[PDB]
With several copies, the nearest count.
Chain A
Amino acid sequence: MDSQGRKVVVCDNGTGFVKCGYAGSNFPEHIFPALVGRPIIRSTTKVGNIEIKDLMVGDEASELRSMLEVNYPMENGIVRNWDDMKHLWDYTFGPEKLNIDTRNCKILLTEPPMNPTKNREKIVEVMFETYQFSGVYVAIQAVLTLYAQGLLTGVVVDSGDGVTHICPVYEGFSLPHLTRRLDIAGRDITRYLIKLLLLRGYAFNHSADFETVRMIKEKLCYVGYNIEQEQKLALETTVLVESYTLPDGRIIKVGGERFEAPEALFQPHLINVEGVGVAELLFNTIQAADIDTRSEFYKHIVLSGGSTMYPGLPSRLERELKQLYLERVLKGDVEKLSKFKIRIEDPPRRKHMVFLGGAVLADIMKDKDNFWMTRQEYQEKGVRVLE
């Protein structure tokens, strides 16, 4: 922009992956699983003779499993260590993930709503004991979706493995005393799902194995759409079941759980820990939403991330949300169910917008110390780092 394409960076601090690069890179120009680990024990046998490395981060940690003590010191995809993060940061600065230095430079990142920020502040003070940028930017995680297109209304919605979010929005204001999120995604769903598999005799040790569901969950998994007709079909036909080679070799045999594990989203009482699930929460959300907003929201609500590049569930949701409406609220009027125009709201760009959602601000903001928060405003003991 007003200076080089280097020396400013954008990064998704995501829970499945970190996705990162110089600000306005084509993609998040490096992507890696959010993984770390440093050596322990796996083999029980005389093999390997490796020499080459000890500790690992992310894309180089992948092969190793228990050859590393792997960790994610976490609750809600929000960390509870300071230091392995550092060794990751220290790694990332190489062509490793970035090829950068930081004092000379500036960066764009994100913050949880109700981040207990005293810990961000301590980290930031360490960043400004270390990486020490000439300027910085941070904003509430969901807000950065509305940026490639300059958007203002709806609910702002996210998921993946670690967490889910549900931000009610109008004229760009999220409605804060009114706001929602859900504190999980595919992680503990994989705990529940793998509990099903023990019962099949797939009693396999999790410690080496849980993240196998991840392979297929990432490479291969889906949702249907017909889904109540699909329940009817599934036991009556039986032959609609599936299987796959665990790539050590083993074909293991797998029913609807492939995308019936999603039913715990809409009926958390699946896991006996009760729930009407997110689709009832959504009804409640739009019951709280006012006349105009709820009516606009028939085609005016917003979605994010690779976790939204998802077949059939959108179709099943509107199939579903014609209902509770008609049922509870129209209480039997019907004549407008399509006349409530309905057009879909999750496009191919939801792939790259994990970082490209952020990047379209830097495209108008790198020259703006109107925007840049600073190392100076930390050094001040200033009440926050920001203009």
Chain B
Amino acid sequence: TTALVCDNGSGLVKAGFAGDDAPRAVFPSIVGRPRHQGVMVGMGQKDSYVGDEAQSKRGILTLKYPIEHGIITNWDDMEKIWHHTFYNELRVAPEEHPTLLTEAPLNPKANREKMTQIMFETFNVPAMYVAIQAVLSLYASGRTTGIVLDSGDGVTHNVPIYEGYALPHAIMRLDLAGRDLTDYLMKILTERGYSFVTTAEREIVRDIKEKLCYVALDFENEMATAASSSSLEKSYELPDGQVITIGNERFRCPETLFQPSFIGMESAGIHETTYNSIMKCDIDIRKDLYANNVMSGGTTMYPGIADRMQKEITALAPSTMKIKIIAPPERKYSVWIGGSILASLSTFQQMWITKQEYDEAGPSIVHRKCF
């Protein structure tokens, strides 16, 4: 009873409640199970583990992540997170709750059905409404006009809008995000020397990539420098004390976005692909859209990229257009916070699919009710 506010995207859980102005808690969407036998069963640690408590204990366990179109899903034991996430981390089962939900476009049709078959026939939530997560950033930021080029950890989009009318032929889905970097990123530096790494260490290649790396500002001459130079070394210390001298690395992968051709790819650059996408975007407001961009979304704190984009946007920009590109604080959190603005609206509660509607349409309501 009442409704609740969170981020449920492929990266971090960012759980909170309605009437806050940040998530209550921010943590990884990890779960899994002892592939290494917990032999002395009950030996001060679990039979299966989640999030932080799995990460605190990780090596015993095979630990999971869910999605790619026609190449990854797991659907069921998403439960295994959820119910504890709820009846412990929300400290309630959503079986009680009028409820906020979110999704993304062009899932398999049946995706919506597995969701809803769970929501009702499993979790028995009374009433609820699904939406696009970017709407909450827009609840916060209030823009009419712009393209939300974005990456999470686990998904990418462009989102053109104009004066209402978020563009249904020009808003985009792509699987690639903050995820896929670390894999390539691992491949090299037994070159640097570090002959000692796997998945369980890909862990820290998730990490330093985000703690201190920035997107290169003009990577060509940063590498013309590196090909002769050693001044860059904001280095890292291995687990109990070896400083791996490091710090030119701290931007070196970040051309791969402008050049998926690095990874051999049939894809043009990020910017090229977005300029191509602008041909699918409206013909007219290609005037406007330069003067029309401000930060929100989890990645939006990241260094070296924002100028690089404004600069590359500029390097492809027309005359008669002003290249407004701006980064307000807490941009990383404005989806959670926008969800707590949305929680003010009794009409969004009038927007609920009731469990009743998943009975009285039969199941069949979902592709013809939620946002």
Interfacial residues, chain A to chain B (CB-CB below 8 A): 75-76, 114, 116, 146, 152, 170-177, 269, 272, 274, 287, 291-292, 295, 329-330, 333
Contact = CB atoms under 8 A, between A and B. Distances in A.
B263 A177 contact: yes
Interface in B61-105: 62, 71
Nearest to B40: A172
9 contacts: A114-B188, A152-B43, A172-B38, A174-B39, A177-B263, A272-B36, A274-B35, A274-B36, A333-B243
A75 B196 CA distance: 10
A170 B239 contact: no
A217 B239 CA distance: 39
A117 to B, nearest CB: 9
B264 A116 contact: no
Contact of A75 (B43, B60, B195, B241): B195
Given A152-B43, A291-B241, 12 more contacts: A114-B191, A116-B191, A116-B193, A146-B40, A171-B39, A171-B60, A172-B40, A173-B37, A176-B264, A177-B187, A274-B35, A292-B239
Given A116-B190, A177-B263, A172 B241 contact: no
Contacts of A269: 35
* Top 10 A-B residue pairs of the complex, sorted by shortest distance between their CB atoms: A171-B38, A172-B40, A173-B37, A173-B39, A171-B60, A177-B263, A172-B39, A291-B240, A173-B38, A329-B241
Contacts of A330: 241
B328 interface: no
A181 B40 CA distance: 21
A174 B40 CA distance: 10
Interface-centre pick from A75, A152, A174 (highest chain B CB count, 10 A) = A152
Nearest to B37: A173
Interface in B219-242: 239-241
A208 B52 CA distance: 47
Contact of B60 (A170, A174, A333): A170
A15 B361 CA distance: 69
A311 to B, nearest CB: 32
A295 B193 contact: no
A170 B39 CA distance: 9
Contacts of A177: 184, 187, 262-264
Contacts of B71: 287
Interface string B97-128: 00000000000000000000000000000000
A269 B263 CA distance: 32
